[PDB]
Every structure is written in C-alpha cells, then in structure tokens.
Design an enzyme around this catalytic site. Structure first.
Site, mmCIF file in Angstrom:
data_model
loop_
_atom_site.group_PDB
_atom_site.id
_atom_site.type_symbol
_atom_site.label_atom_id
_atom_site.label_comp_id
_atom_site.label_asym_id
_atom_site.label_seq_id
_atom_site.Cartn_x
_atom_site.Cartn_y
_atom_site.Cartn_z
ATOM 1 N N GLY A 43 0.751 -1.244 0.000
ATOM 2 C CA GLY A 43 0.000 0.000 0.000
ATOM 3 C C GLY A 43 0.787 1.303 0.000
ATOM 4 O O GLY A 43 0.200 2.387 -0.044
ATOM 5 N N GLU A 44 2.110 1.202 0.067
ATOM 6 C CA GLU A 44 2.987 2.372 0.061
ATOM 7 C C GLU A 44 3.077 2.997 -1.355
ATOM 8 O O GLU A 44 3.237 2.292 -2.350
ATOM 9 C CB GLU A 44 4.376 1.976 0.595
ATOM 10 C CG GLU A 44 4.462 1.738 2.145
ATOM 11 C CD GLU A 44 4.180 0.289 2.622
ATOM 12 O OE1 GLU A 44 3.078 -0.242 2.348
ATOM 13 O OE2 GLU A 44 5.062 -0.313 3.290
#
Length: 179
Positions: A95-96
């Site tokens: 999710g970064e």
C-alpha cells in the site's frame, strides 16, 4: 546420505520477520545463491513466505533490491489483465505510494517488450485496474459503465483506448477480483 536434513525453513521463519536477514542466512549455509537471478528465483518459486513480506521486499528503495525486483518480473501474448493478475498473485500488493510506482514502472516496461501507445499507457492502465479491483465494498454506487471510460479519456497520447477494450476489461475484474 540420501535424506536432506537441510534447514531452508528456518530461513523462511527469518525472512518473515526480517527479509534482509532471511535471504542472507540461506546464502550463509549455502542454500540460496547470490546474484539476483537466485533471489528472484526464490521469491517467485518458494511459495510458503508471507505475501506481505515478499511484496515489501521487491518494492524497496535499495539499488540491490530494485535489481532483485527486475529479475522477479523477468520470469512471469496473453491479455493485459491476464498479466497484471499474474504479476500480483505472488505477493501482497504493498500500500505504500513509492513502492507501487517501482512495480508498475517495471511491469509496464516489461509488458511492452514482447494496440497501446507507450509504456506510460500501460502504466496508467494498470493503476485504473487497481482502482477497480479495490473499488469492486462499502460504497453504494459502483464505477459507472458510462464512467471509467470518460474517466480514462486520454491515455493513448491524446486519444482514448478502444471503448470496447475498457469494457471487456471492466467485466473481467468485476467477476474475479484479482486480490
């Protein structure tokens, strides 16, 4: 003897706590080779490792890890989506923000290698699909059949992608949500 009292699982328990320590211990006792084709042929081969811990590895900002990610892509004709899902099955998509870019840059440049306009076209197309496999659970309205096409306008230089293609794409992932 014929048996194999080889560790190679302790390295697994270690990789799941610390990827850097795990992929070195194996290379310490002599189970995993050096270079990048070895390590890339490990994340992709040995599927018993946490998917979050493998997805965070190849999406690391290290110049040694970016190489360790390129060899990962260089392993595994078919539909574009039939490649995005295959790419994202081996690990948990991180999710970064900076990591997702590191992955979709090499996936778009590797696809456009063996319709469309540039590698930047598949790049943004990959993200619209990830903007649909996540969209299709707590929202009443879904992505409009009319929308998503008006929203993806201007992806081939100045023009759109065949409206029949974005449509064939839409119906696929709304049935089978890759991840």
């Amino acid at each position: 003897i014929k048996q194999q009292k080889e560790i190679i699982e302790h390295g697994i328990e270690l990789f799941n706590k610390k990827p850097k320590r795990g992929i070195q211990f194996l290379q310490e006792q002599g189970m995993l080779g050096t270079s990048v084709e070895d390590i890339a042929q490990f994340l992709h081969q040995e599927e018993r490792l946490d998917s979050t811990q493998v997805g965070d590895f190849l999406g690391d900002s290290a110049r040694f890890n970016k190489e360790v990610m390129y060899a990962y892509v260089d392993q595994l004709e078919k539909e574009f989506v039939s490649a995005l899902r295959t790419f994202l099955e081996g690990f948990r998509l991180p999710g970064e923000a900076q990591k997702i870019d590191r992955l979709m840059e090499k996936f778009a440049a590797r696809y456009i290698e063996c319709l469309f306009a540039s590698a930047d076209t598949a790049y943004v197309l990959a993200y619209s699909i990830i903007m649909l496999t996540t969209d299709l659970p707590q929202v009443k309205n879904k992505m409009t059949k009319e929308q998503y096409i008006k929203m993806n306008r201007g992806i081939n230089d100045s023009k759109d992608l065949p409206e029949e293609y974005l449509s064939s794409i839409y119906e696929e992932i709304e049935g089978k949500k890759i991840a």
